[PDB]
Amino acid sequence: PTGSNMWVIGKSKAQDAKAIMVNGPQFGWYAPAYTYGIGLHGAGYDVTGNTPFAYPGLVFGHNGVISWGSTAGFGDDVDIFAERLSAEKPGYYLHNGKWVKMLSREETITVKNGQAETFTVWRTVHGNILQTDQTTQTAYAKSRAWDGKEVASLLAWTHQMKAKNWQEWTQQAAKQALTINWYYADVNGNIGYVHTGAYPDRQSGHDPRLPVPGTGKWDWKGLLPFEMNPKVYNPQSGYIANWNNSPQKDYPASDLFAFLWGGADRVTEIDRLLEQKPRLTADQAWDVIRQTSRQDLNLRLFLPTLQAATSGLTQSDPRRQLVETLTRWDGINLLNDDGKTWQQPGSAILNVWLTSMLKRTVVAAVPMPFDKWYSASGYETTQDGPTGSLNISVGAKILYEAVQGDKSPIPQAVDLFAGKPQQEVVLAALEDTWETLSKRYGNNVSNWKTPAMALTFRANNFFGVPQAAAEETRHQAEYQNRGTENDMIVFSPTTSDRPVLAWDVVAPGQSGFIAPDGTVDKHYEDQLKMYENFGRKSLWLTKQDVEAHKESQEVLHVQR
Amino acid sequence: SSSEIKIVRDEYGMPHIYANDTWHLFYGYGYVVAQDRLFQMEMARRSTQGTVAEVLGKDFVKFDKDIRRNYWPDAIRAQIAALSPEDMSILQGYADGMNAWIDKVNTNPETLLPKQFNTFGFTPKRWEPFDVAMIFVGTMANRFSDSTSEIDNLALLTALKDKYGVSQGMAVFNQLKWLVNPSAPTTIAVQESNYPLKFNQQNSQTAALLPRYDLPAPMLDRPAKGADGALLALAAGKNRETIAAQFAQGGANGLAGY
Ligand SMILES: [Ca+2]
Ligand SMILES: [Cl-]
Known part of the structure; x- marks a missing residue:
């Protein structure tokens, strides 16, 4: 879950x-x-x-x-076994030197106001078949350690x-x-x-x-x-x-x-x-x-990086002033009295910044269309709000390792910053962030009323x-x-x-x-x-507490 | 009494069951569940067994097939058939309890049938031990303890090797999807213990053995949902495009997320 x-x-x-x-x-x-x-x-x-x-x-x-x-x-309690098939033995797979017969069952989907559909489910010693790539003569079976x-x-x-x-x-x-x-x-x-x-x-x-x-x-x-x-x-x-x-x-x-x-x-x-x-x-x-x-989960991860990148910037630099806003914030989001917007704009600032960062780093290092697996900041939602918990995105976790430098234990096989000093990339993302947010909300950060999640x-x-x-x-x-x-x-x-x-x-x-x-x-x-x-x-647990808080009762007499 | 089951509800309507043996205790539980959550339980039953289309129509056919393709019901039945009398009593009592209330409902539907059965155009049928087991099995196991993306990972690895060459592709895969990372914050402190099995890049032999994988990553075929949490029931093509757009935007936290 x-x-x-x-x-x-x-x-x-x-x-x-x-x-x-x-x-x-x-x-x-x-x-x-x-x-x-x-x-x-x-x-x-x-x-x-x-x-x-x-x-x-x-x-x-x-x-x-x-x-x-x-x-x-x-x-990890689930592994996938790439089953070897044979054109001479349809519905069989090679296992321990023999052609073993898959189990199969026919299922019919009855459909309200439609025609029923029948299909087959296949299974091997390693589990149910998820898919078959017939050109590769492979069927992929999903093995769960808790099967049985x-x-x-x-x-x-x-x-x-x-x-x-x-x-x-x-x-x-x-x-x-x-x-x-x-x-x-x-x-x-x-x-x-x-x-x-x-x-x-x-x-x-x-x-x-x-x-x-x-x-x-x-x-x-x-x-x-x-x-x-x-x-x-x-x-x-x-x-x-x-x-x-x-x-x-x-x-x-x-x-x-x-x-x-x-x-x-x-x-x-x-x-x-x-x-x-x-x-x-x-x-x-x-x-x-x-x-x-109410805790923004990214602030703690990237504040140090943002602080370092803006440390020598002038007081009038908008990249620095976005980071000063973040530094003053504990990352706890609270609703304004309209019941719609957040009191502080930090989450919006992090969203835009991190989206820009990921586009510039992890996304650029991964081939399309797999780059789209690492582009999310984790903040983009819908009007109804998140369908579950919020987490630090996978792209952000990868980026975090990169910005930790030699403090990270993960070898950077590809420099996500592509030969550019990290400070340059972090500042460019901040320049993008200021452009996006100042065009939408104006230049007075103290009156920005950014959308809260519902x-x-x-x-x-x-x-x-x-x-x-x-x-x-x-x-x-x-x-x-x-x-x-x-x-x-x-x-x-x-x-x-x-x-x-x-x-x-x-x-x-x-x-x-x-x-x-x-x-x-x-x-x-x-x-x-x-x-x-x-x-x-x-x-309540005890009979005394249940009884003291009793609203109604029913007594049944049944034999099995 | 041996035959007596007492049900007490508190001020928030939470039931407390008093019984003297296993079958009676779980019968009381099933009975109160059928009183409180019969429509929810009926739809969970159909969700866990892939029988939603039977009452909701064509938009749930792919969903029903996907549920049925992800488990092997006869294996669950063989587990139930192996149970001792005491263990079977939990499942059978529960089902039997639900059934007692369901029979009362279908006998006086004018006041006891949940409104949603009228709205959705069907009536509730009895439960068996398998149905009870499948609520759990279909939720906790078949969905919430069944997470793998190995074929997607092979798809990504094929693409990484195509872009960077074989060794560097594998090394970038290790950077993006590490086996283990010693800086991960752990629920058990390192002073207490460490996991004895040491997994690392060096010893792997199986990544070299597989075929280069070029079909669409299977994560793109999960049925897309909209903002209401409903299934979109799209063409296979528009579904893949919806999942990619939703995932690029919101990732694991979003609509096509985890
Ligand atoms: Ca695995
Ligand atoms: Cl994510």
């Missing part, structure tokens, strides 16, 4: 509590809500929280002893909810086969992290970023043991922070071209806030959502399929680079006699029900304003 953040604060770093867990899974924003609030009590379970698509297993929740969360792992373990993963996410300590919980973490960061906290203040999933034990020499021959010599050896999954229990830092960044030193990322783990990483924004104060309260931990949601709870689910009527779409003025939902669990708080306190927000509301006559449920939209203003509602 492309974005997701988490910060877990342990005993050594928590104020007025023994542990604090704050999770912000980013799936995009939908109506009705992407996640589902649910409490389960009996059959060995005693839990509360919320979970995507109402899975049996709560991804975000606690059981009164321990609490858990997730963020997308993005490890999909159901076990769903069950691992359910059974983990019964764990009472780290050892029991990691026994279920070892069964979860998708590439997912899992997080743990408990009543005693212990905290932990596991970069869960099945990862292939590849042959020596296998470059996991590119396909390998499917004829047998490059077949995976099997799966790596759980010992190899990156994990930490009670880190000496006292905290665990993640925003889909690398789990651990030397661990390799997904092979997706647009995904990189490099020196420029948005997780640094969470890390600086956690290291800043010796200890954090649950309220301060919750406030990290607001701050990171947020939309879309009526189509992430697949692009309607899950509500189009009129059910909801809008919020302020885009916030945060979880679709946010949940926080606090263990052994000094502000209560309860051993655990928990809060969440499931917007627009718990219910998506609309009666036939159009009456929307009483819980159709009661968490929308709360979402917008960084509010939250208590999650």
Whole structure:
């Protein structure tokens, strides 16, 4: 699920509590809500929280002893095998010296007010065929390390909810086969992290970023043991922070071209806030959502470069004055009172500058039409706003390595600046930026009212399929680079006699029900304003707390 | 009671299920889900199984084929068939619970049928354990833990080698798409541990073994969406042009993004 953040604060770093867990899974924003609030009590379970698509297993929740969360792992658990075909053996591929018969199945798509279509799906020992290049006599099969373990993963996410300590919980973490960061906290203040999933034990020499021959010599050896999954229990830092960044030193990322783990990483924004104060309260931990949601992610990366490039320029030089505006700014975007524009113009300045930089550097070094994979600054959006999290663009991460000079560990096989001093290129981009922005907004930087990003709870689910009527779409003025939902669990708080306190927000509301006559449920939209203003509602666990907050009840008698 | 399931909803309508065995507990969960999110769950079911066109028409045919081409349902069924009685009870109870509410809905549709079923012109059918498993499998696994662009990467590598020659093309590929970068900020501090498997440029043998790849990068064939998040259902040609324009403009953060 492309974005997701988490910060877990342990005993050594928590104020007025023994542990604090704050999770912000980013799936995009939908109506009705992407996640589902649910409490389960009996059959060995005693839990509360919320979970995507109402899975049996709560991804975000606690059981009164321990609490858990997730963020997308993005490890490389998928490789593509280039299968060798034969004109003499249609539907076969060469594997371990023999012509092996592909599996195939016929599927018929029934179409409302149209003619049905039938097609075939093919599969090899390495997975389903994605495509076939018949001129090259190759079929590409997608091999997932978690193939065969999909159901076990769903069950691992359910059974983990019964764990009472780290050892029991990691026994279920070892069964979860998708590439997912899992997080743990408990009543005693212990905290932990596991970069869960099945990862292939590849042959020596296998470059996991590119396909390998499917004829047998490059077949995976099997799966790596759980010992190899990156994990930490009670880190000496006292905290665990993640925003889909690398789990651990030397661990390799997904092979997706647009995904990189490099020196420029948005997780640094969470890390600086956690290291800043010796200890954090649950309220301060919750406030990290607001701050990171509004943080421009590029300012910190490129300010030093911009400052150096403009250091000897005159006070009247507009390239310098754009950088002075940026230097004065902390990069936190805030709406003006019109509910449309941002108080400061820095994001616009960075967008234009970075777009110009990338056009001049990474884009110019990559052949068309692949240059268009590295041109985005990451800021360009639509009137409805971002469909997910915002990140530092892939082109920006590459550019960051280049502007770090010999501080970067990445050999610059091609000088992205093409023989020109970097200062010249950075200043040219600033000249472009001043031209573009001063023509649009005038020469008085202090009155520039640049467009803020908005947020939309879309009526189509992430697949692009309607899950509500189009009129059910909801809008919020302020885009916030945060979880679709946010949940926080606090263990052994000094502000209560309860051993655990928990809060969440499931917007627009718990219910998506609309009666036939159009009456929307009483819980159709009661968490929308709360979402917008960084509010939250208590999650109950105990029978006493559920009962005290009881709105309605139903008792059923059923036999299986 | 063994047979008793108690459902308590709080002040935000969040359900709490009280039951005495696995099947009853998950039945309560499925029941409340069908009460709260039946249309959403029905469409998620169709999304995860590639049966959207059946109710929404021709614009979702390519989508349905793509979903079906990306998994092997009999393998999921064999996983479910292997489950112990206790594990099967989670899936079966859940489905059974949904079904109890769905039957009540189709018996008194005038007040209980979600409005959207009338708007979209169909009624909800019962759920099986496979359907429940497929909500998860189709979302978390088949979409969110299935990220690879190796064929696109081979396409880019072919182009880099054509522009720069073979060794330099590969070296520029390593600059743009590094295997690992020691300066990446890591969730686990280096004082704690490091990953024992050391991946580097030197040892790779497989990049040299593949065919030069010249068809359109496959990322250009993902179905384009507009600003409402809806599928555009375009010709293959206009789809590729839409994805390229959207990706050049917004990259991974944009409309054709990740
Ligand atoms: Ca791979
Ligand atoms: Cl990007």
